């Protein structure tokens, strides 16, 4: 399962510079988002100095 992983990854997606590119662009899409979630979620957890301020001052 492990060797065949990197292998299959090469087989189906890496040879043809086509797919190789098709994947990195498609892989950049999902990544950009998942990185911005975790990253912001991290920025929040170490803080909580703004935003939950909203639940207080407004709500109308």
């Amino acid at each position: 399962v492990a060797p065949t992983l990197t292998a299959r990854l090469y087989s189906l997606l890496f040879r043809r510079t086509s797919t190789f590119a098709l994947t990195i662009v498609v892989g950049a899409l999902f990544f950009e988002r998942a990185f911005d979630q975790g990253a912001d979620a991290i920025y929040e957890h170490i803080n909580e100095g703004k935003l939950w301020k909203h639940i207080k001052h407004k709500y109308e």
Binding site: R16, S18, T19, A21, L22, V25, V26, A28, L29, E32
Partner: peptide
């Protein structure tokens, strides 16, 4: 053809993203 098709798939997603 498969190559030119795949190259369009790259440009599509590419602009879109």
């Amino acid at each position: 053809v498969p190559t030119a098709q795949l190259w369009g798939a790259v440009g599509a997603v590419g602009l879109v993203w």
